[PDB]
């Protein structure tokens, strides 16, 4: 629960990317010119009013002041998109000069600043992309072990979504094996963008190849996850870390908004939108209302603010 402040760089020499500071003095860690890399930069509100006064006297950059008691990633994003009237925001830079312990945002991509040069743009969409992420084992499939397409209308809706550029990101928690069968069984991949498996579990991380099935080009479902929280509970959230990682692997570096669609609300750590799939032992053809919901969710920013 804190007041907050943000730089807005005057000359957007690099766009969209934003940073978070532990010190007003961190400018010294940044040195010359590199501030021109970061369109906006958030800092916790000054305790001493003289700091804010000197800031107010500085003309080198624009700035904003606000409250964000809501210590949440997506809520902060929403607030900032309001403040600067911008639908999209870049990645958050980090340094070995360790960030302020705003670790409530822990689960996120962190850019070690120098990768800024590594920031290629990408072809993959001519519009700014929306993204939707999915699961197999109990998400949208029929509950029969031989799953069925709930609706061929959905089957073609898959391709239709390309009209809007909605990117389609399956992460089955189930092993690669059932996906290996599913692929041959139904060319949803022929309608569908990105696939991942093995998400079921988290491993006790501590400091102490699949192509052969049919000559595929598919990912090593590597052990990229970590304990991350090391606490007495049993949650396997969908991971923006891995997700964005794969996105930048696809050179996907920006997005409008991302929705998770799954049967498990718990994994949603404040995703933009969550679609609790209605588990079904029949092809329900319920997709019509799911469509409508998602469309309205998209429209939310037609007003320039999600609400």
């Amino acid at each position: 629960q804190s007041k907050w402040i943000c730089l807005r760089l005057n000359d957007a020499i690099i766009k969209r990317h934003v940073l978070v500071l532990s010190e007003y003095a961190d400018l010294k860690y940044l040195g010359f010119e590199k501030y021109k890399f970061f369109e906006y930069v958030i800092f916790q509100f000054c305790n001493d009013p003289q700091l804010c006064k000197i800031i107010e006297n500085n003309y080198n950059y624009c700035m904003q002041i606000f409250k964000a008691p809501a210590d949440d990633m997506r809520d902060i994003r929403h607030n900032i998109k309001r403040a600067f009237k911008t639908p999209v925001l870049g990645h958050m830079c980090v340094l070995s000069n360790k960030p302020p312990m705003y670790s409530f945002l822990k689960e996120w991509f962190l850019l070690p600043h120098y990768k800024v040069v590594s920031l290629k743009s990408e072809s993959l969409t001519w519009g700014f992309p929306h993204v939707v992420v999915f699961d197999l084992d109990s998400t949208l499939i029929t509950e029969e072990e031989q799953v069925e397409i709930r609706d061929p209308f959905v089957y073609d809706s898959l391709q239709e979504l390309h009209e809007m550029g909605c990117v389609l990101v399956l992460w089955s928690y189930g092993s690669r094996d059932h996906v290996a069968h599913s692929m041959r069984d139904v060319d949803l991949e022929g309608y569908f963008d990105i696939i991942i498996s093995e998400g079921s579990t988290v491993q006790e991380e501590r400091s102490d190849i699949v192509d052969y099935n049919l000559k595929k080009r598919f990912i090593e479902n590597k052990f990229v996850f970590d304990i991350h929280n090391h606490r007495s509970d049993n949650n396997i959230p969908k991971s923006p870390k891995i997700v964005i990682k794969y996105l930048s692997d696809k050179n996907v570096n920006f997005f409008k908004s991302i929705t998770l669609v799954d049967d498990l609300p718990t994994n949603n750590y404040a995703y933009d939108f969550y679609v609790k799939v209605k588990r079904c032992p029949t092809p329900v053809q319920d997709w019509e209302h799911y469509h409508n919901e998602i469309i309205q969710n998209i429209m939310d920013y037609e007003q320039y603010f999600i609400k």
């Binding site: 000359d11 020499i13 010294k28 860690y29 040195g31 070995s96 000069n97 040069v117």
Partner: protein, 210 residues
């Protein structure tokens, strides 16, 4: 670099030293004076001002200084000694320091190399072409080189002086015979500000070859 801003801090200390001598009674660029015998008193006074800045930054906790001391400069290799282009002396209470101009002048005649040698930020529109769109102060790297060179040379002398003052004549002789006390020693009382001292900044070795 995570040290890069500290290298900039070193640049800052350097410029702080430079501007004071560049403004206070700064008649001419160094070589114009040093090529001539004119106002050897001015030359020695500039040296003393350098020593003052050194006492300052090395031991800033107390700015007071025993400015009362004598000066000599020489033009005679029969007086000169290799390796110590400046030397302190005491004569029956007559504290004095002595120099040979020609040695240091001849020293400061080779700063003509160029850094066109090693890696830097990669050629890119970000590096340049980005600037191609949208958005007496006369100093050059060679002069800065020479000035830092002279500073570094005087550092040796100042450390020698400190030691001599604190330990008397015999230990001065001992150190001149053997500068090993210089050898790899940051360890100090905080008053020395030893990290301020540029020995911390650069390291070198010869290899005996063939």
């Amino acid at each position: 670099s995570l040290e890069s801003y500290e290298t900039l801090k070193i640049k800052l200390a350097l410029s702080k030293y430079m501007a004071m001598l560049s403004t206070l009674e700064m008649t001419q660029p160094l070589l114009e004076i040093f090529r001539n015998k004119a106002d050897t008193r001015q030359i020695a006074a500039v040296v003393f001002s350098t020593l003052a800045f050194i006492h300052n930054r090395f031991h800033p906790l107390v700015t007071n200084f025993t400015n009362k001391m004598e000066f000599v400069v020489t033009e005679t290799n029969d007086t000169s000694i290799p390796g110590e282009p400046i030397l302190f002396t005491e004569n029956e209470g007559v504290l004095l320091c002595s120099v040979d101009r020609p040695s240091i002048v001849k020293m400061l005649s080779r700063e003509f190399d160029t850094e066109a040698l090693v890696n830097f930020e990669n050629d890119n529109c970000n590096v340049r072409i980005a600037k191609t769109f949208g958005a007496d102060f006369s100093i050059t790297e060679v002069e800065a080189t020479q000035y830092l060179t002279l500073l570094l040379t005087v550092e040796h002398a100042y450390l020698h002086y400190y030691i001599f003052k604190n330990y008397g004549v015999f230990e001065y002789c001992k150190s001149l015979t053997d500068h090993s006390l210089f050898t790899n020693k940051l360890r100090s009382t905080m008053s020395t500000k030893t990290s301020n001292l540029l020995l911390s900044k650069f390291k070198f070795t010869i290899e005996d070859f063939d």
